[PDB]
Every structure is written in C-alpha cells, then in structure tokens.
Amino acid sequence: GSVIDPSELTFVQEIGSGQFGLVHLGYWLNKDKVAIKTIREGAMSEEDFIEEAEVMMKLSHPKLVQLYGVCLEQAPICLVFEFMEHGCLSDYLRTQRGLFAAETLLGMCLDVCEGMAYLEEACVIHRDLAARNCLVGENQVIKVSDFGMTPVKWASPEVFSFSRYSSKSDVWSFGVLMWEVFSEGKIPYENRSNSEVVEDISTGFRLYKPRLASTHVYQIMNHCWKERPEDRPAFSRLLRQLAEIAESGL
C-alpha cells in the first residue's frame, strides 16, 4: 500500500475513542474525506497494527472497507481509511429505529454475508464480527470493517471455552449480528454477565426472535447458532439461503 506523510492529513473532528485508539474525520491531500485511525500508544504494537493494514489492502470486495494507506513517520502512527458516511451499523440501526422495512434489514445482512463469504474463501477469520464492526455507506450499503486482526456475546461456545476460531465461529457471530439488525440495534443478552451468557448458551438458550424477523429469518439465525461448528452453514451457503428468503418469506 501507499505510505502517507503526516503533513498530508488534516484532522477535522474526533468521532470515536476505542481501546486500540482514536478515530477522526479528516482529509487527505485536502481532497479525500478519510477516517483516520490513530494507534493507542502501548495498548498495541506498531508491527501488529501495521500488519492489519497490509492484510486489508490486498482483500478487495465491495462489502469490505478500504484504505488509502498508512502513516508511519510520526508516532502516534495511523491508518487512513475511506470515510463511511453513516458510521457504525449498531449505532445507525439504533438512531433509525422504526424507519426500517424488514426488506432493508435483510439487505444489510446480505451485504455483510457477501463480504464474509469473500473472507471465508480467502481463509481469513474475522474473530470479532458484530454490528459495531460494520459500517454504513450511502444508500445504506454495509461494509465489514476491522477484518485484518491476528466480547463473549458474539462468541461461539468453542471460542469462549477453547479459543477455537474458524470461519464457522464467524458464522455464530453473524447470527448474533443478524439479531442486532432485526432488533434494530438492541444489545444482545443485555445486563447479563459473561458467566450468565455462557451458562445460558450451554443450557440451550438462544436470543429471542425479534418482531421484524420472520420465521424463516429466525430459522437461519438458529442454524448459525448450532452447538457444533460443522452443523452451521458456511457463509457461501448462508448467502444463498438469505437471498432465497428475500424473494419468499420475510
């Protein structure tokens, strides 16, 4: 990827403050609107932070966020991404609650599923798929973000007990992301501790069917939440199941 000099960035407004660093609305070259992600000094190594960018810069799909480049010269170092006009999906769903047709919500799931099928094919495991790590562009296009990395509520049981990450553990997470979309940004397992969530899931409890989700939609969420990873569908199959409902039973 392209190396960006710090002098080429204009920081306009701080919009986010995470564990791994700050996010700012900015401009590159006084031209392109960008989301600038500054590393949090100490909280993560520059090597790892940079390697995430490298991974991302060679994964090209319409439903995966893109970078303009990396700014290494002046610490704190940063990644420079394209600016997604409507911010993160979890917040978007929350602020637009009541203004969504079920068809639109299904389309958002489809967008995320297309990007995840691409990642799955590339043998790239996300590890932290959640509405909070998806972004909203124009005409409500959803892109997957933060997908180049090396939250118990989105973790499959084999992940929360044994750290067995896989594309099928991403599918469990996608099921929870589907629940977030159809509940229009509710927090899954609200006010429950990790111990309680683990126990509930190990018991057979699953997130309740949201009002805007049809029976078929909920059947698909549940297939993502099967106990054994091998009983869950791959993203490339989920994509077509989700598309078939868009015609039939919403």
Ligand SMILES: COc1ccc2nc(Nc3cc(C(F)(F)c4ccc(F)cc4)nc(N[C@H]4CC[C@H](O)CC4)n3)sc2n1
């Ligand atoms: C991978 O990092 C990236 C890449 C691109 C990108 N684009 C972004 N755009 C916006 C736009 C707006 C907005 F202001 F235009 C906006 C806000 C609310 C709303 F309802 C509608 C629009 N808010 C935000 N907020 C951030 C979301 C992600 C979070 O971790 C940090 C805050 N990002 S972030 C980003 N990160």
